[PDB]
Subunit: 257 residues, 4 copies
């Protein structure tokens, strides 16, 4: 594919799941990809194996550790991208956590780590990438991976849903601030995205059937289901799209019981 | 080549967004049915687009089918099936916005706006969706709605409910038609420079005022909707249904 | 005296579809708040009987009301209701548009006649009832309030409601556009969005105790709504408590919309 | 008598919307905890409000409790319980909007905005809700958010996410606290003339431009939010939770 030929794409949280699938598809569309990961041993291992898979089909990618909760990570990722590839053209902000926990006994540290990682870290990663895009003067695209939970509630996600709605709101306000520099800012809202079914347990499979019944398309999402929408929003197919959000949920949001 | 071997029906495709979407689908490999109003101007515009498409190697036919006539849906599907053997994508785009104040709104003006923009769309969607279910191969439906689906307009009290109604139709059809692999979504164009508003935008002081409200710094053009429509019609959007997508250069978020 | 409120004292309120359900409860509470109420009904035998029994109850607790038959699908009904209100009470100050139908039906075999009756009753008839009321409010020069009773279905889909959800979304959009058009005349326009409300309509879905238990378990507040649960929000939007509220919508659903499952 | 004998905690109540909401709660029979920042101006405003309320026969106390200090929620609850025996309503209103461009936003300013507007709200809601659950009599929580929860602002990249986050917090808390009869809702004020925007509103030309964008034809006053807040706090809203209410004179829908 050639939707992102000669663009440098940073993807945060890209060692597994949606970010992994997005980074891969960006590389398949001709981009040179900075695979950001958490800096953990599993994160590094997944980032490097993705880099290998990309190298195998002729792509170009590097892996960069950068804990999203560390607010210095944005400039570290931009610096690594500019050092290796000379530019930053697309940011896919995807790193996040969702430690389910009840509201009335939520500890401060868990709440603050969730906001810190999902929203504050995103803020300054977007800021670092957008600064570089403005300095280049060639435009850019920023995509925040948020969630259907940006639009509705979850009882075990009182600390989590505000960060997802926060991300949507950040893209709306950045769209105004960065529009004069040709930088488009949008959000994708994944619904229920499943992990590999061959690795699930029997109990995990029984919950899969109930959640699947809730989706009009008749199946849970896969990480690759988010790659097309992310690459669309990063590309010239979306040349007039900014300040927008896009549900990628198989109809889950509209399917009121 | 996102739509190779797909039959695409575009309603109201002789001018504006519909014309650009029909041409782009054809460039992506689709066989395109160019639906128009049946008027003399509609027929001429659809004819010229069909010739343009044929000139770059694409395939298209032109079909008159007044969107206000509830028989038009089956006529378009029958023409598509006769010419190309299938219906795989519907881009519902025919619509009118006769600006008029609310307190003196004529009943027949209101009824023609709802009849064209919403009622005609309902039964065009129904006719295409039936064929798609019958084929058993899935499909995609894209309603061209508007930013006006989300906010108000004092001279559009008859019009904004049809745009919001179209979005809602896509949400409910996504549920009804999801088990058949038929995805239903809406695009919400912002301020698009077309033939309808060309005289209003001739006022270049007005144009600069309208332009200053768009963060991307320009008004839209019909090709700005072509990419998002083809995306929603394609396998890039295989898990997208019941969704809406603003295509407005940031207009909606830019609270003045 | 009956511990009547005064939020709507000296105001004339037209309620369409007021013989039963949400409309009946709204009309009753407006009268408890001091309003003179036009109890609009469909003209059917059942509608007329329900409107008369409400008028008897209101009269007995010291309120003021009249019953007026006015089929919402007849686009002349808006002017009929306004004329009755002006003749009986001298003004029109609040419109609560509540008349509507939801004949559940699948999409692919939806008949034209059923679809067109649903749009005609729920949206077209509301449009010209709002128009007739708003013209009288403008002519009076004392402002007013319009409340459309829409539905949570204005925000989400329903497979057996492809003909119905667009009319509910359309009503919300109508309030947004009318808020702009009528704001200069002091007329505020808002929509209320009820969730699952146990009314006579969904009598037979709720007849199934197992279905009813599942529907109740989806509401965070833990119960289905009652028509009286909509009376307070409607009266609020009609009153000076909401003097700066226009172009707005209000979910009244016990948390159903936010409770993603 | 919408709130007779209820204990209402209002944060940020020395001025503006919070001050008017605290006053109206007391006019409805509530005993009011006037939360303020602890600054000299916060202390003076809270005292004058407490005296205002006392002068018309109400009951109130003032409590300094910086919303950025995450201990403040339990400080307010403890003061409410000692003075008045219960907590029944929380109006979360404390917030800041230090306008600043995005690309040079300092970390300290961003973190103080999130910390005050969202993090402090979270743990104030948590403290109030714990006490409401222990009492077993239900309760009401109202977050004062903004129209900016729905749209963007170039000089508010740090601010609008906190306002949208407040709305989302009420949505999730409505689910978690529903079983305990605790309703959670947000109000979204439009352009409200307060001490914050006071200097910008002395420019007569700009005030006219901002007024012309409101369909009701005037800017809001703090009293304009009091009615909606007391409504959401009361039995008039007994089936309302997880909901949001624009209080903006039509500003949001009035697309240019």
């Amino acid at each position: 594919g050639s939707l992102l030929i000669d663009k440098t794409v940073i993807v945060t949280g890209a060692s597994r799941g949606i970010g992994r699938a997005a980074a891969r598809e960006c590389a398949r569309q001709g981009a040179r990809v900075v695979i950001g990961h958490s800096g953990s041993d599993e994160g590094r291992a997944g980032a490097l194996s993705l880099a290998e898979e990309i190298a195998a089909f002729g792509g170009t990618a590097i892996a960069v550790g950068a804990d999203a909760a560390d607010l210095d990570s944005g400039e570290k990722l931009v610096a690594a991208a500019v050092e290796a590839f000379g530019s930053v053209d697309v940011l896919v902000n995807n790193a996040g956590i969702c430690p389910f926990h009840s509201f009335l006994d939520m500890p401060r540290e868990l709440y603050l780590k969730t906001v810190g990682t999902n929203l504050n870290g995103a803020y300054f990663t977007v800021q670092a990438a957008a600064r570089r895009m403005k300095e280049q003067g060639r435009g850019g695209a920023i995509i925040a991976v948020s969630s259907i939970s940006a639009l509705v509630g979850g009882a075990m996600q009182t600390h989590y849903t505000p960060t997802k709605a926060g991300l949507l709101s950040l893209m709306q306000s950045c769209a105004i601030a960065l529009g004069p520099y040709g930088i488009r800012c949008n959000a994708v809202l994944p619904g229920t995205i499943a992990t590999d079914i061959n690795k699930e347990d029997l109990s995990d499979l029984e919950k899969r059937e109930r959640m699947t019944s809730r989706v009009p398309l008749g199946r849970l999402g896969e990480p690759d289901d988010l790659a097309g929408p992310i690459v669309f929003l990063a590309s010239d197919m979306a040349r007039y799209v900014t300040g927008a959000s896009l549900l990628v949920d198989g109809g889950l949001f509209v399917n009121l019981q």
